[PDB]
Design a protein around this nucleic acid. Sequence first.
DNA 1: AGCGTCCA
DNA 2: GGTAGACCTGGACGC
DNA 3: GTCTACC
Length: 316
Amino acid sequence: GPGHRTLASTPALWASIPCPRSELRLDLVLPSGQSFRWREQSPAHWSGVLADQVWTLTQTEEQLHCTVYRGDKSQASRPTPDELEAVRKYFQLDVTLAQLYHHWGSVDSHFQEVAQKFQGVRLLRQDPIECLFSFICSSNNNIARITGMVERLCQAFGPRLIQLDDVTYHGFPSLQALAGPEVEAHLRKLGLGYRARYVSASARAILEEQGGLAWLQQLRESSYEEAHKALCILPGVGTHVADCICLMALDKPQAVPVDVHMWHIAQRDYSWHPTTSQAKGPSPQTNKELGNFFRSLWGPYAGWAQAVLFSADLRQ
DNA sequence: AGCGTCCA
DNA sequence: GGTAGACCTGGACGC
DNA sequence: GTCTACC
Ligand SMILES: [Mg+2]
């Protein structure tokens, strides 16, 4: 289909949001394992699905430039202010990252050193359903493979949106699409491994046992502790996946995911060891202590600080 | 050379 | 609870 | 990273 746009080539189709590079680096956020659905289809231009539509995003020094492909057989035009609000909300631009970076660096000199090189790593505010099933796919897995699993899952079960060049975009599947008793076998053919059952069983649990889609809004409005505990009822969701969802979709900035990276970071970069367990290796008790350690260190937005160090550790 | 272990 | 080990997949890469 | 089984 039509080409992926670049800002310099189609300026009439773009609009900007005030956004200095100190507040956001697309290249350090979009491919770093928060969302798995963005691709750099042209140099410095990132395309993906945002609020049921395909967008391309690119940055200049002080502005985030956006273009939207509506795909309702309407004439091409720049994004409207209402449409740009969805982009603003997705990047949570109301939160000033420079002041968080100064706070985290002031309490943690290691953070300060890493942060000098990794500016503008902020937290996306993701759709709860997309975030839930993407991080169910993420456990005991690598970001390259996760990215393919999420792509194939959307191609098979999500609505077709539009085609740009040779790339066909799909929306994220609904709960209902993932809940059928045939879905697990299909997801296994798509290479999801043992997480195929987790995806289908979790879609069924939400629909059949938790009151449907409104449950995620309930958890958004609940405390961190309540939301984190509730998510763990889902097959494939343990304390880490629940923290990922809390932090990245349920507005819990203190949630600190603890994966292989953060465990290695704690040991290597902080010389940390658990003090509430004589055995020091990863365990339910020591993983929970490590999350508390990072909250005690970094404060109420510790999960956002985690995202800076996680993004940096992917490139080392 | 490419199997087979390591690892995310 | 605490502990141990199995587990789908496929790129990295030692031997 | 989460699940299951055993202590
Ligand atoms: Mg669970």
